[PDB]
Amino acid sequence: YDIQAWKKQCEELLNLIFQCEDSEPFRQPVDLLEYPDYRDIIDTPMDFATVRETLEAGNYESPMELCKDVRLIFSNSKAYTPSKRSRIYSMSLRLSAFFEEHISSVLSDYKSALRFHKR
Ligand SMILES: C[C@@H](CO)N(C)c1ncccc1F
């Protein structure tokens, strides 16, 4: 029932994500010189360094907010992909499955701790 535990759990999960080779295209903001039309398709860029920095600055109030930004990394890749078979998109799908598998207990534990706090 620790209402704060999610933060360190998210730091450790982001550490695992940065160790994954599949996260390399998503570690830093998309380079506009490599993908000149990126902002014509994507309204809200997001990357894992921005997520980590937001967490470390104390600018997420809950793991749901972090989860919304990580999911935006994956939806941006899906929206930008020219093909559902593209290399970078395929890496995003594996990384998304890994993230979802690990974030589920973080969200469950936080929501349960918060319900206990408000009992
Ligand atoms: C990091 C993502 C964009 O959000 N990246 C550039 C791409 N995403 C999917 C397919 C091809 C790509 F090049």
Side-chain angles (χ1 to χ4, degrees), residues 1-7 9-119:
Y1 306 132
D2 182 336
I3 298 159
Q4 283 92 49
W6 64 279
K7 180 168 186 186
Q9 289 162 1
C10 287
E11 293 169 348
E12 309 279 37
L13 178 52
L14 290 168
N15 287 341
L16 290 174
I17 287 169
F18 272 87
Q19 301 182 187
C20 289
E21 285 175 13
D22 284 337
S23 69
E24 201 282 339
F26 312 103
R27 293 175 194 162
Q28 298 295 318
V30 172
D31 190 333
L32 309 181
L33 300 168
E34 294 177 355
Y35 302 103
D37 62 340
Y38 195 70
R39 299 298 301 276
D40 301 339
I41 300 140
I42 302 303
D43 283 328
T44 308
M46 188 54 56
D47 65 276
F48 286 110
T50 295
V51 171
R52 179 184 264 163
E53 282 157 3
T54 302
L55 183 67
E56 296 301 274
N59 289 353
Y60 285 130
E61 187 180 5
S62 71
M64 296 84 78
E65 290 177 352
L66 179 143
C67 186
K68 180 176 157 174
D69 282 349
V70 171
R71 288 170 174 171
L72 178 61
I73 299 173
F74 304 133
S75 60
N76 286 345
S77 183
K78 187 171 189 179
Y80 190 67
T81 195
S83 169
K84 282 176 184 199
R85 299 174 63 228
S86 293
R87 178 76 198 275
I88 292 167
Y89 174 65
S90 70
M91 291 167 78
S92 82
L93 294 179
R94 290 190 296 264
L95 194 67
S96 172
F98 176 81
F99 172 77
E100 292 296 328
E101 174 176 293
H102 285 85
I103 204 68
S104 54
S105 61
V106 178
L107 292 167
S108 294
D109 287 355
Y110 174 79
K111 296 180 180 173
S112 156
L114 213 59
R115 287 189 297 265
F116 189 78
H117 188 70
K118 306 173 174 318
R119 77 200 184 276

